[PDB]
Scaffold this active site. Structure first.
Site, PDB file in Angstrom:
ATOM      1  N   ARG A 177       0.846  -1.217   0.000  1.00 47.49           N
ATOM      2  CA  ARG A 177       0.000   0.000   0.000  1.00 47.49           C
ATOM      3  C   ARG A 177       0.854   1.228   0.000  1.00 47.49           C
ATOM      4  O   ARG A 177       0.855   2.094   0.893  1.00 47.49           O
ATOM      5  CB  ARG A 177      -0.975  -0.093   1.160  1.00 47.49           C
ATOM      6  CG  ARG A 177      -1.995  -1.200   1.119  1.00 47.49           C
ATOM      7  CD  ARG A 177      -2.893  -1.063   2.343  1.00 47.49           C
ATOM      8  NE  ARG A 177      -2.112  -1.222   3.602  1.00 47.49           N
ATOM      9  CZ  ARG A 177      -1.563  -2.324   4.039  1.00 47.49           C
ATOM     10  NH1 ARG A 177      -1.758  -3.521   3.511  1.00 47.49           N
ATOM     11  NH2 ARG A 177      -0.562  -2.255   4.945  1.00 47.49           N
ATOM     12  N   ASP A 242       2.085  -8.366   6.860  1.00 41.15           N
ATOM     13  CA  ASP A 242       1.052  -7.689   6.124  1.00 41.15           C
ATOM     14  C   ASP A 242      -0.191  -8.418   5.808  1.00 41.15           C
ATOM     15  O   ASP A 242      -0.622  -8.141   4.592  1.00 41.15           O
ATOM     16  CB  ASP A 242       1.641  -6.769   5.038  1.00 41.15           C
ATOM     17  CG  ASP A 242       0.730  -5.585   4.745  1.00 41.15           C
ATOM     18  OD1 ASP A 242       0.407  -5.267   3.582  1.00 41.15           O
ATOM     19  OD2 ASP A 242       0.236  -5.014   5.718  1.00 41.15           O
ATOM     20  N   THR A 243      -0.500  -9.604   6.195  1.00 36.21           N
ATOM     21  CA  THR A 243      -1.667 -10.345   5.748  1.00 36.21           C
ATOM     22  C   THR A 243      -2.739 -10.545   6.842  1.00 36.21           C
ATOM     23  O   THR A 243      -3.739  -9.835   6.799  1.00 36.21           O
ATOM     24  CB  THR A 243      -1.289 -11.723   5.068  1.00 36.21           C
ATOM     25  OG1 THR A 243      -0.505 -12.459   6.068  1.00 36.21           O
ATOM     26  CG2 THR A 243      -0.483 -11.480   3.763  1.00 36.21           C
ATOM     27  N   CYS A 348      -1.350 -20.230  -1.230  1.00 36.93           N
ATOM     28  CA  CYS A 348      -0.675 -19.770  -0.045  1.00 36.93           C
ATOM     29  C   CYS A 348      -0.239 -20.900   0.834  1.00 36.93           C
ATOM     30  O   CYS A 348      -1.085 -21.644   1.353  1.00 36.93           O
ATOM     31  CB  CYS A 348      -1.707 -18.890   0.748  1.00 36.93           C
ATOM     32  SG  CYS A 348      -1.006 -18.254   2.288  1.00 36.93           S
ATOM     33  N   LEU A 349       1.071 -20.919   1.145  1.00 37.08           N
ATOM     34  CA  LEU A 349       1.603 -21.955   2.056  1.00 37.08           C
ATOM     35  C   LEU A 349       1.316 -21.531   3.543  1.00 37.08           C
ATOM     36  O   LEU A 349       1.335 -22.473   4.326  1.00 37.08           O
ATOM     37  CB  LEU A 349       3.154 -21.987   1.863  1.00 37.08           C
ATOM     38  CG  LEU A 349       3.646 -22.645   0.562  1.00 37.08           C
ATOM     39  CD1 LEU A 349       5.102 -22.261   0.359  1.00 37.08           C
ATOM     40  CD2 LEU A 349       3.550 -24.158   0.830  1.00 37.08           C
ATOM     41  N   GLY A 350       1.067 -20.282   3.752  1.00 32.37           N
ATOM     42  CA  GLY A 350       0.850 -19.777   5.129  1.00 32.37           C
ATOM     43  C   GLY A 350      -0.618 -19.906   5.573  1.00 32.37           C
ATOM     44  O   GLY A 350      -0.950 -19.333   6.657  1.00 32.37           O
TER      45      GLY A 350
HETATM   46  C1  HEM Z   1      -5.098 -13.672   5.586  1.00 32.03           C
HETATM   47  C2  HEM Z   1      -3.934 -14.259   5.397  1.00 32.03           C
HETATM   48  C3  HEM Z   1      -3.306 -14.452   3.994  1.00 32.03           C
HETATM   49  C4  HEM Z   1      -3.830 -14.348   2.800  1.00 32.03           C
HETATM   50  C5  HEM Z   1      -5.208 -13.809   2.362  1.00 32.03           C
HETATM   51  C6  HEM Z   1      -2.802 -14.758   1.828  1.00 32.03           C
HETATM   52  C7  HEM Z   1      -2.950 -14.699   0.452  1.00 32.03           C
HETATM   53  C8  HEM Z   1      -1.977 -15.197  -0.395  1.00 32.03           C
HETATM   54  C9  HEM Z   1      -2.156 -15.239  -1.853  1.00 32.03           C
HETATM   55  C10 HEM Z   1      -3.396 -14.671  -2.556  1.00 32.03           C
HETATM   56  C11 HEM Z   1      -1.097 -15.882  -2.349  1.00 32.03           C
HETATM   57  C12 HEM Z   1      -0.801 -16.200  -3.846  1.00 32.03           C
HETATM   58  C13 HEM Z   1      -0.134 -15.052  -4.587  1.00 32.03           C
HETATM   59  C14 HEM Z   1       0.023 -15.340  -6.118  1.00 32.03           C
HETATM   60  O1  HEM Z   1      -0.544 -16.303  -6.618  1.00 32.03           O
HETATM   61  O2  HEM Z   1       0.715 -14.400  -6.586  1.00 32.03           O
HETATM   62  C15 HEM Z   1      -0.222 -16.225  -1.282  1.00 32.03           C
HETATM   63  C16 HEM Z   1       0.989 -16.896  -1.409  1.00 32.03           C
HETATM   64  C17 HEM Z   1       1.875 -17.058  -0.381  1.00 32.03           C
HETATM   65  N1  HEM Z   1       1.713 -16.694   0.939  1.00 32.03           N
HETATM   66 FE1  HEM Z   1      -0.141 -16.299   1.777  1.00 32.03          FE
HETATM   67  N2  HEM Z   1      -1.640 -15.058   2.508  1.00 32.03           N
HETATM   68  C18 HEM Z   1      -1.937 -14.946   3.862  1.00 32.03           C
HETATM   69  C19 HEM Z   1      -1.091 -15.232   4.908  1.00 32.03           C
HETATM   70  C20 HEM Z   1       0.184 -15.744   4.770  1.00 32.03           C
HETATM   71  C21 HEM Z   1       1.095 -16.004   5.857  1.00 32.03           C
HETATM   72  C22 HEM Z   1       0.752 -15.862   7.367  1.00 32.03           C
HETATM   73  C23 HEM Z   1       2.245 -16.394   5.321  1.00 32.03           C
HETATM   74  C24 HEM Z   1       3.552 -16.891   6.024  1.00 32.03           C
HETATM   75  C25 HEM Z   1       4.421 -15.953   6.321  1.00 32.03           C
HETATM   76  C26 HEM Z   1       2.100 -16.357   3.872  1.00 32.03           C
HETATM   77  C27 HEM Z   1       3.061 -16.876   2.989  1.00 32.03           C
HETATM   78  C28 HEM Z   1       2.784 -17.134   1.661  1.00 32.03           C
HETATM   79  C29 HEM Z   1       3.738 -17.734   0.723  1.00 32.03           C
HETATM   80  C30 HEM Z   1       5.111 -18.309   1.140  1.00 32.03           C
HETATM   81  C31 HEM Z   1       3.161 -17.718  -0.481  1.00 32.03           C
HETATM   82  C32 HEM Z   1       3.779 -18.166  -1.840  1.00 32.03           C
HETATM   83  C33 HEM Z   1       3.524 -19.554  -2.299  1.00 32.03           C
HETATM   84  C34 HEM Z   1       4.233 -19.898  -3.686  1.00 32.03           C
HETATM   85  O3  HEM Z   1       4.439 -18.905  -4.401  1.00 32.03           O
HETATM   86  O4  HEM Z   1       4.309 -21.091  -3.836  1.00 32.03           O
HETATM   87  N3  HEM Z   1       0.809 -16.032   3.546  1.00 32.03           N
HETATM   88  N4  HEM Z   1      -0.766 -15.831  -0.076  1.00 32.03           N
HETATM   89  C1  LIG Z   2       0.223 -11.391  -2.624  1.00 34.71           C
HETATM   90  C2  LIG Z   2       0.888 -11.798  -1.264  1.00 34.71           C
HETATM   91  C3  LIG Z   2      -0.294 -11.700  -0.237  1.00 34.71           C
HETATM   92  C4  LIG Z   2       1.649 -13.176  -1.254  1.00 34.71           C
HETATM   93  C5  LIG Z   2       2.285 -13.261   0.173  1.00 34.71           C
HETATM   94  C6  LIG Z   2       2.714 -11.776   0.426  1.00 34.71           C
HETATM   95  C7  LIG Z   2       2.211 -11.004  -0.867  1.00 34.71           C
HETATM   96  C8  LIG Z   2       2.160  -9.482  -0.714  1.00 34.71           C
HETATM   97  C9  LIG Z   2       3.188 -11.497  -2.031  1.00 34.71           C
HETATM   98  O1  LIG Z   2       4.064 -10.803  -2.516  1.00 34.71           O
HETATM   99  C10 LIG Z   2       2.764 -12.943  -2.342  1.00 34.71           C
END
Ligand code: HEM
Ligand SMILES: CC1(C)[C@@H]2CC[C@@]1(C)C(=O)C2
Length: 405
Positions: A177, A242-243, A348-350
């Site tokens: 943002r 940030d999520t 998302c792995l998280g």
């Molecule tokens: C409300 C919580 C969250 C939401 C809505 C969310 C949403 C997303 C989305 C939409 C993506 C896919 C992005 C793409 O396709 O470009 C993503 C990927 C990812 N997020 Fe989550 N995220 C959340 C929380 C987290 C947390 C807590 C972590 C761990 C620190 C995290 C780590 C990741 C990682 C490592 C990926 C990449 C997976 C890959 O590219 O194989 N996320 N997330």
């Molecule tokens: C789109 C996302 C939510 C996902 C995890 C952090 C984020 C800002 C990325 O750059 C990949």
């Protein structure tokens, strides 16, 4: 600041949506985005804002595009292009099959088994934070809970000092943002300045923290490079900071306004998990995209190689073709359809971590503070971007209606 229409774009597909500053923001960020799904808007539109890009508005299109990495590459996933160009996080800026080995490692650090291990800390912090607020009869939910809760857990996982939160948080926010204070490349560089020394330290003298595991990991049978580790860790930090932070504020703003939903969860706790899914559908908050690797005709529109397309994860579950009465929160929906955590190879792995932080917050807050509302005369402002957020969330309650545990 509208960019001149490229030659290949039919003027009838033009809809000038500013993902950073949508028109209806006052109504709520989800509502501001849902303008894209009105009957007057084609399924796939071109916006002239932010340098010009496509936007898919329907869940079917979004899912399809996410599956299609051949045509829609992760290489440049952020809008505007300069941000997507500067973007080099792993695994996210990679396409299969390359992505796979990096994802496997990141899963090691954030996956199910890690959540299982941290469960007690998550419960412990939530309880401590809530109990500390309870007797006050008022907080700033965003700064008082939504930030510290998920942040501190991540800082624990990562083995990083709580002292760094403010600096890290600032940089993370610039990426999703943007303020205008810093370019993406600048923000990215500063985060990298931070991480470099730490990774070095953790390659030499490993810990059990996420950064140590990542820094010393194996990818394609050989050791990860410093650069690779730096790029993975940069992503973990953004995801961590940030999520969940923003999501909890939307969810709490909604519960502050809906006595009936609060009650439902208090009496019928078995519904919490369902409720969590419904809230992740309704208060979805991420929107990134992909870049065309070649000329391609998608649902009858001609996409040119190098065109960027926003495929807003937020919109799938808001689509009326996917969920009846999308703007209505219903904990007993037969099917909660969303792509809040993404779709395709970059799911998302998280997610497991995020769901456990959400369910704990709901159970533990509602236990102690069943009855609360938004402060009289507070106007809640949402902010849009790659990840949307709430600026501040003043809550009030009568301490006499609380329960100590
Ligand atoms: C409300 C919580 C969250 C939401 C809505 C969310 C949403 C997303 C989305 C939409 C993506 C896919 C992005 C793409 O396709 O470009 C993503 C990927 C990812 N997020 Fe989550 N995220 C959340 C929380 C987290 C947390 C807590 C972590 C761990 C620190 C995290 C780590 C990741 C990682 C490592 C990926 C990449 C997976 C890959 O590219 O194989 N996320 N997330
Ligand atoms: C789109 C996302 C939510 C996902 C995890 C952090 C984020 C800002 C990325 O750059 C990949």
């Amino acid at each position: 600041n509208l960019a001149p229409l490229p030659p290949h774009v039919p003027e009838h597909l033009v809809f000038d949506f500013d993902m950073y500053n949508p028109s209806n923001l006052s109504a709520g960020v989800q509502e501001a985005w849902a303008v894209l799904q009105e009957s007057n808007v084609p399924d796939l539109v071109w916006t002239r804002c932010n340098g010009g890009h496509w936007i898919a508005t329907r869940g079917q299109l979004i899912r399809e595009a996410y599956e299609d990495y051949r045509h829609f590459s992760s290489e440049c996933p952020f809008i505007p292009r300069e941000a997507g160009e500067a973007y080099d996080f792993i695994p996210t800026s990679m396409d299969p099959p390359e992505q796979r080995q990096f994802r496997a490692l990141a899963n090691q650090v954030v996956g199910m088994p890690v959540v299982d291990k941290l469960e007690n800390r998550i419960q412990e912090l939530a309880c401590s934070l809530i109990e500390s607020l309870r007797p006050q009869g008022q907080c700033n939910f965003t700064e008082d809970y939504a930030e510290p809760f998920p942040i501190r857990i991540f800082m624990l996982l990562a083995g990083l000092p709580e002292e760094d939160i403010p600096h890290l948080k600032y940089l993370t926010d610039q990426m999703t943002r943007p303020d205008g204070s810093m370019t993406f490349a600048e923000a990215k560089e500063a985060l990298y300045d931070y991480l470099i020394p730490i990774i070095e330290q953790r390659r030499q003298k490993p810990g059990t923290d996420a950064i140590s595991i990542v820094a010393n990991g194996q990818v394609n049978g050989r050791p990860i490079t410093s650069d690779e580790a730096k790029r993975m860790c940069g992503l973990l930090l953004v995801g961590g900071l940030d999520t969940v932070v923003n999501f909890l504020s939307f969810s709490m703003e909604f519960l502050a306004k809906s006595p009936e939903h609060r009650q439902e969860l208090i009496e019928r706790p078995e519904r919490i998990p369902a409720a969590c899914e419904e809230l992740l559908r309704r208060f979805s908050l991420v929107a990134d995209g992909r870049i065309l690797t070649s000329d391609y005709e998608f649902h009858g529109v001609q996409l040119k190689k190098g065109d960027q397309i926003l495929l807003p994860q937020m919109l799938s579950g808001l689509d009326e073709r996917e969920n009846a009465c999308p703007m209505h929160v219903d904990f007993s929906r037969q099917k909660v359809s969303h792509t809040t955590f993404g779709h395709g190879s970059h799911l998302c792995l998280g997610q497991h971590l995020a769901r456990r932080e959400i369910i704990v917050t709901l159970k533990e807050w509602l236990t102690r503070i069943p009855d609360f509302s938004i402060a009289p005369g507070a106007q809640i402002q949402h902010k849009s971007g790659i990840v949307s957020g709430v600026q501040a969330l003043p809550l009030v309650w009568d301490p006499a209606t609380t329960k100590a545990v």
